[PDB]
Each structure stands twice: as structure tokens, then as C-alpha cells.
Amino acid sequence: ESAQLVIHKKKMTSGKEMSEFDKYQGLADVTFSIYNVTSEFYEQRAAGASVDAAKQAVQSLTPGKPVAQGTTDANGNVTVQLPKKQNGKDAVYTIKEEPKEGVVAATNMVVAFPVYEMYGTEELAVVHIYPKNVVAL
Ligand code: NA
Ligand code: NA
């Protein structure tokens, strides 16, 4: 009933691990805070938003206390576990990078369960993400 979310923080110059990103240095000691936006997603949906629009909307929301937080290790990685469901519904989370001196923070990202490899037929129990700031890139 929980999935692992593996967050890879890269200094940038599918849902599965992507070897392409190994060209970039991993950044240690970066904290990510993960917020439950499940209710907010379903509200957007009930108001007629598409799945994509609903995700885009809740991307800017960080309601309440983070359900999880993790700080990257020496290689730039951290795993957190997240419930696949919240209040009986397929869960949606907003992932926020905490500000850190000398680091360009990623834009907030949304992860909506279940996750399929981008879509394949097998649900992922391990989801890999690579938060980035495209405007900065
Ligand atoms: Na998804
Ligand atoms: Na990044």
C-alpha cells in the first residue's frame, strides 16, 4: 500500500531510473518536502479539470504538514515512502525542493498514483524522479 519515491537531485547543465541523468553531478544535503494534494486534485477533477490540468493546478499547492521529507545523500539521492492511497483514493503529491545556498531549486513536481512507465501496463512500486528548473537550464 506504499510506494518508494526515489528523488535524484542533479546539477543540470519515465518514472524509472534514467541512466542519461548520470552525466550530471548529484547534489548532497538537499531537502525535499512532499505534500498530500489528493483532496485538492479530486476537487479540481470534480470541477471539470483534465488530469493534466488538475496536476498543473495542484503543483503550486503545499497544504498542511509534509507527509514526508528527505535529504539527499552524498550521491544526491533520497528515498521516501508514500501511501498509494489517501482517504481511499489514488494519491497525489506535490514535491517541493527546500531552498539551499548555491543550489538552483527545482520547480515543484507532482506524482499521481498509480504510476506506470511513460504508459505501460505494469504499475511501479518504485518511482524515480529528477526534479529540475527548466527556466534556469
Ligand atoms: Na501518474
Ligand atoms: Na535540478
Side-chain angles (χ1 to χ4, degrees), residues 1-15 17-24 26-55 57-64 66-117 120-121 123-133 135-137:
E1 67 176 334
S2 274
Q4 292 177 74
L5 180 67
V6 185
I7 310 174
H8 306 268
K9 180 58 183 185
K10 299 306 194 183
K11 177 179 201 180
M12 300 195 191
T13 62
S14 77
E17 188 161 16
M18 290 180 66
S19 54
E20 301 94 309
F21 288 105
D22 200 52
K23 75 182 92 164
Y24 305 115
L27 299 175
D29 292 308
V30 178
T31 301
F32 292 83
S33 301
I34 300 84
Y35 295 86
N36 181 17
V37 294
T38 301
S39 293
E40 293 73 10
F41 174 86
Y42 289 103
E43 287 171 358
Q44 290 283 346
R45 295 282 296 135
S50 75
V51 172
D52 184 68
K55 290 169 42 174
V58 301
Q59 192 175 299
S60 60
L61 302 184
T62 56
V67 298
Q69 206 168 44
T71 297
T72 60
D73 66 20
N75 297 325
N77 307 312
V78 61
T79 302
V80 298
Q81 278 180 304
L82 299 173
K84 289 185 183 178
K85 296 219 192 310
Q86 290 285 347
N87 291 349
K89 302 184 153 178
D90 291 332
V92 185
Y93 299 98
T94 287
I95 296 79
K96 174 173 160 196
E97 183 175 336
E98 300 297 338
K100 185 180 174 70
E101 289 167 51
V103 173
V104 178
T107 299
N108 293 356
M109 302 198 42
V110 172
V111 178
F113 289 99
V115 184
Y116 302 94
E117 183 189 352
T121 42
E123 158 174 13
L124 304 183
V126 186
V127 178
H128 291 262
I129 64 169
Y130 297 83
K132 67 194 155 135
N133 194 318
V135 167
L137 268 147

